[PDB]
Amino acid sequence: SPLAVGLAAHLRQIGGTMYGAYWCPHCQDQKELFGAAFDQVPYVECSPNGPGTPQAQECTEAGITSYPTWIINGRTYTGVRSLEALAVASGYPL
């Protein structure tokens, strides 16, 4: 998707970051909106050790309490967001 690639680059450039868990269905749904374009999106893995385990120190210290959580322009957006919603949050056109 041209929108997905353009938006992903934009998120990378402004440091818009997704915090999630590789095994979390919502996180998987979020990545799937981007498809392969997700490769550019800054992503923090909060659960490298899997379900039920204490999350990554960086996630606890960032105050992550749900997956996915986006931090974009210092603003916090919890849960899955459409490409359109992420464009609006990040100031990416159309």
Q: 49: number of CA atoms within 13 Å, CB side?
A: 6
Beta carbons of 11 and 61 less than 8 angstroms apart = no
Residue-range domains of the chain with CATH: 1-94 (3.40.30.10)
Residue indicated by tokens 């056109």: 93
47, two tokens: 């659960």
Provide the residue type at 32 as one letter. Answer: E
| Declared resolution, Å | 1.7
Provide the residue type at 10 as one letter. Answer: H
Sign of CA dihedral 13, 17, 22, 26: negative
CA 1 and chain centroid, separation: 17
PDB experimental method: X-ray
The three-point CA angle 54-55-58 to 5° equals 135
60, two tokens: 């606890």
Instruction: Give the 3-state secondary structure percentages of the chain, helix then strand then coil, rounded to 5.
Output: 45, 15, 40
Spatial distance between the Cα atoms of 44 and 30, rounded to a whole number of angstroms: 14
Helix (H, G, I), strand (E, B) or coil at 37: helix
